[PDB]
Symmetry: C2
Subunit: 464 residues, 2 copies
């Protein structure tokens, strides 16, 4: 990895475009006006990519050679990079202040600020815009996952009177559905801010290396079938496949995909009659988890529940909702996103089924079908020093008021009613609003303040 | 990186679920039934993740300890992985056959097959499903980027009579808007299959290392401003910023973002009057490229062109379309995806503006707003040998015939009309359709067949 080659190409030319006599460029990130966002993932980027000796003679030469060919021209700021190598032994003269990881912040507030600590390095602040803005991704996954947690909490509480098992109700299925190995780990770690169930193994190492937990691992799985393990037995032998698998995993929870040929027949005839004796004997700690995986997600869940409620003893919980026996549960892992998850839990409640009966698995919906535009994540220059005088800078495009940026030096505060406000134009220095919530997390090549994964989960909790 | 920890958790339990005495699992990838897809990116995966000694005593021990805690149990196949280390020096006993990279193949055809080459490693075929399925991402970037080229080609030909400079008409802006560094390199490389203009630098090194080009680099950029480099001058000095920047880059193309406060004023008054003398003196090889960046994409482009058409000497080309002078162009890089790209060029044609006048930048729409479901990318077991008997396997869910999978040993063929057909159930062996078009690209830890980025580009060309 070479930080000199990890920026937008045009940024290589910006050192020639800023006003002459500029000693400071100060910039910030917001989720510009999903009304509150979980701030998570910066600490990964600081440690992986930004800290320590990030400039060498060799990286400067490599970048010089690449850009000469890429631009067909000599624009690369070799002198500038060489200055960092010589003066700071290749450590970035940059200060970053950030809201603590896990904090839940309303849209349109400063989440982090970036400035150069040496007047020579005025061009560096926005050099690293590209890498820092990629923080949009763990923010958005963390945020969208917690929004699904809110829906789940709401309906579980209404239909059952409590929140037991909430943290295992949305399982990460997204390893194959994301764009790379690196994305898989980052995305999976972001979902684990809110939940404990994951099949995206990549998230575990990332958390362990960059954040840390008191517990051995941040996330858990159970044995589960896929279509190749059912279909390999041949179409006439689905029953043999189910029997083999549940007997193999007789003492732990086991998920068994049941829609290879006909989900309704598998529920009613195979699980519900032929193998019923191998199900009713299971423990509460080792249920059979039937997994439908096709058809309209709502229609299918409701029909599976209807089938099972006719073949197995249903109870009615204290809220008046129907409950399968403890040895039997359902996971819907197909077509799951925040919209369809809401549609399913609502349709269930309508039909008097407890949300206790159901869990969800989500791949693409959870980890891939998200953009930097969902929370309008943007990084803008708001303050510069030119000729030793500070000036408040911003954009305000005529045809789009929603692209207006903030002015001057920024700080984030609690309001008297306990909300948040971002103070502009260095007004936080007036101290009318208690103390700035942004803390220095990076300064001059060093990570200066870290958060464990345990503190992040605590910060990101739901109210209730 | 540890391949033992690079699969969906459930697959760790699958070796216990297959029928007893299974010696072969054979699987395949297709873009299940955007009618044609560019096959690109498997070779990156083969080289980075799968080839060579990918199993060591330490990776086995690492995986063992992680899974013990992740499953709260001993499920991990320590013995099977030890067998691979001991028998093959940690090289994967796997054969992969694939269509050549760059090939443009209709939906619902076999793209690659995977099978184990040791009866003991029947469980390994689908172990590596997760990692290979991520090939969806470069396939989908390459395909959607090629779909945009087809639109650009059609309107450029229609408005101008030729395709000159088509390869620079869609510029990659998506580095900040993807989910990771790795993703950035992968997606940017996929875009470079069709085009030559990129600001995502990460794409260059990936191509150079994994594919190779004749040319020093596969992609090019030009100097361009961002809002920080305009706004840093102060709102009253937008002219000084513009003058400084074009004068710094007087002899190369320069892109100047012009919407910081008022795009229409910037075009009509600042570029069209105050700084006009510095524009009309520029070379054809060094145009000013005005970049609007807000407002309704189509309405803004038309209005911008209308403004410039009144301030600068417009000609009419040989097709009857209006053309700006050669020292002046426009690039629209806000809100660009394949739908809005189509709307703008069509709206331009309607107003008699040559597509020669315009280029596009795209970030999220190009590299991030895409999922594994856009081309329905799926990997399925189609053939197993159990007790020495080969059997053709598939799924066919009742409520979704679009999830039906293919049966048996597969091959890809030309039809007599020169189209593509995928033959099932070993029927390729009958020789009635000529030769299988898949080639062995990986076998037993070695990459056995390879393509340069130049062969890939040539394979991925448009018919035009
Ligand atoms: O939320 P998603 O990204 O869809 O991931 C979840 C789906 O992924 C797996 O199957 P896959 O989609 O690989 O195959 P299928 O379409 O044939 O079920 C799984 O069985 C779910 O169906
Ligand atoms: O296609 P996209 O992924 O949107 O990327 C392209 C956009 O990104 C950059 O600005 P940015 O979006 O960072 O800030 P802005 O929204 O204030 O223009 C660029 O100036 C384009 O507007
Ligand atoms: N455990 C599962 O059911 C699963 C399915 C697909 C992808 C990931 C996990
Ligand atoms: N060169 C550009 O205008 C650009 C803008 C945004 C991101 C990348 C590149
Ligand atoms: F494992 Be199945 F084809 F979703
Ligand atoms: F660089 Be601008 F804020 F799109
Ligand atoms: Mg599935
Ligand atoms: Mg934007
Ligand atoms: Mg912009
Ligand atoms: Mg699917």
């Amino acid at each position: 990895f070479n930080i000199l080659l990890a920026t937008d190409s045009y940024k290589v030319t910006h050192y020639k475009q800023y006003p002459p006599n500029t000693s400071k460029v100060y910039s910030y990130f917001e989720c510009r006006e999903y009304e509150e966002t979980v701030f998570y993932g910066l600490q990964y980027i600081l440690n992986k990519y930004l800290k320590g000796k990030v400039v060498t003679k060799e990286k400067i030469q490599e970048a010089k050679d690449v850009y000469k060919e890429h631009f067909q021209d000599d624009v690369f700021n070799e002198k500038g990079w060489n200055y960092i190598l010589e003066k700071y032994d290749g450590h970035l003269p940059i200060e970053i202040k950030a809201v603590p990881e896990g904090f839940v912040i309303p849209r349109g507030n400063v989440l982090f600020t970036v400035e150069n600590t040496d007047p020579e390095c005025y061009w560096l602040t926005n050099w690293i815009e590209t890498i820092l803005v990629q923080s949009w991704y763990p923010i958005t996954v963390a945020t969208n996952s917690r929004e699904q947690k809110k829906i789940l909490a709401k309906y579980l509480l209404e239909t059952s009177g409590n929140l037991d098992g909430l943290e295992y109700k949305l399982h990460d299925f997204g390893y194959r559905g994301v764009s790379s190995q690196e994305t898989a780990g980052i995305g999976a770690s972001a979902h684990l801010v809110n939940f404990k169930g994951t099949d995206t193994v990549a998230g575990l190492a990332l958390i362990k290396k960059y954040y840390g937990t008191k517990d051995p691992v941040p996330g858990y799985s159970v044995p589960a079938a896929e279509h190749s393990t059912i279909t390999a037995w041949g179409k006439d032998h689905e029953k043999d496949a189910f029997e083999h698998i549940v007997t193999q995993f007789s003492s732990v929870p086991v998920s068994v995909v049941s829609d290879s040929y006909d989900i309704y027949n598998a529920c009613e005839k195979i699980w519900g009659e032929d193998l019923r004796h191998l199900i009713v004997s299971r423990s509460t700690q080792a249920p059979l988890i039937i997994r439908p995986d096709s058809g309209n997600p709502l229609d299918t869940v409701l029909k599976v529940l209807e089938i099972l409620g006719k073949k197995f003893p249903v109870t009615e919980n204290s809220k008046g909702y129907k409950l399968l026996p403890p040895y039997l549960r359902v996971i819907q892992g197909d077509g799951v996103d925040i919209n369809t998850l809401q549609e399913i839990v609502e349709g269930m409640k309508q039909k008097m089924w407890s949300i206790e009966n159901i869990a969800f698995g989500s791949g693409g919906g959870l980890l891939q079908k998200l953009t930097r535009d969902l929370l309008n994540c943007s990084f803008k220059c708001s303050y510069v020093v030119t000729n030793g005088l500070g000036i408040n800078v911003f954009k305000d495009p005529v045809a789009d008021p929603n692209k207006r940026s903030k002015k001057g030096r920024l700080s984030l505060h609690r309001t008297p009613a306990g909300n948040f406000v971002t103070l502009e134009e260095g007004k936080g220095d007036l101290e009318e609003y208690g103390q700035d919530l942004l803390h220095t997390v990076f300064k001059n090549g060093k990570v200066t303040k870290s958060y464990s994964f345990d503190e992040i989960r605590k910060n990101a909790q739901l109210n209730i």
